[PDB]
Amino acid sequence: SSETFVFTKDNLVGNTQGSFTFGPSLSDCPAFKDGILKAYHEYKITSILLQFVSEASSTSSGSIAYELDPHCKVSSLQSYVNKFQITKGGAKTYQARMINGVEWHDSSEDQCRILWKGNGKSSDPAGSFRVTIKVALQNPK
């Protein structure tokens, strides 16, 4: 079995900070965590598309850093290596080898985590995330 889920994180402002934990902890996608994940013994998220959609002013400033934590060992963003400029938005596709998506996981266990942290102004709308996950599932429950 193979399935795609799209979910959003909306109303980000310039200093927004947060995380997505992919697996049973993926609160932002209840259809995955409460539905599909309860029907199978094993899953693996084989790819993740992280899109930042800007709503920012042409004169806005700052960036939203994002960090892929493949083993769920990072609690809040520490690496500013990768970032989306708030005025431009951006997109990043993650392959299985980079997101712990090669091995099958028990449906009670989380696979990986994306963290973000903006350095823009809290008063200014930045935009939203649109996240697409591709999930393989097997061994029905």
d(CA 122, CA 126): 9
Question: Collapsing DSSP states into helix, strand and coil, what is residue 111?
Answer: coil
Question: Collapsing DSSP states into helix, strand and coil, what is residue 88?
Answer: coil
Q: Which of 85, 101, 87, 91 is nearest to 137 (CA)?
A: 101
d(CA 100, CA 96): 6
Q: Which of 19, 12, 2, 3 is nearest to 110 (CA)?
A: 19
HSE, CB side, 13 Å, CA atoms: give it for residue 90: 12
CA 135, chain centre distance (Å): 14
Lookup result for tokens 């649109």? 130
- Resolution reached, in Å? 1.8
SS3 content of the chain, % helix, strand, coil (to 5): 10, 55, 40
Q: Which residues pair with 133 in a beta bridge?
A: 5, 48
Question: Collapsing DSSP states into helix, strand and coil, what is residue 98?
Answer: helix
Identify how the structure was determined.
X-ray
For residues 79 and 135, the answer to whether their CB atoms sit within 8 Å is no
Break the chain into its structural domains and give their ranges: 1-141
d(CA 81, CA 137): 32
- Spell out the SS3 assignment of 24-84: CCCCCCHHHHHHHHHCEEEEEEEEEEEEEEECCCCCCCCEEEEEEECCCCCCCCCCCCEEE
- In degrees and rounded to multiples of 5, residue 124 shows phi and psi of -115, 125
Provide the pairing of β-strand 112-118 with 63-69.
antiparallel
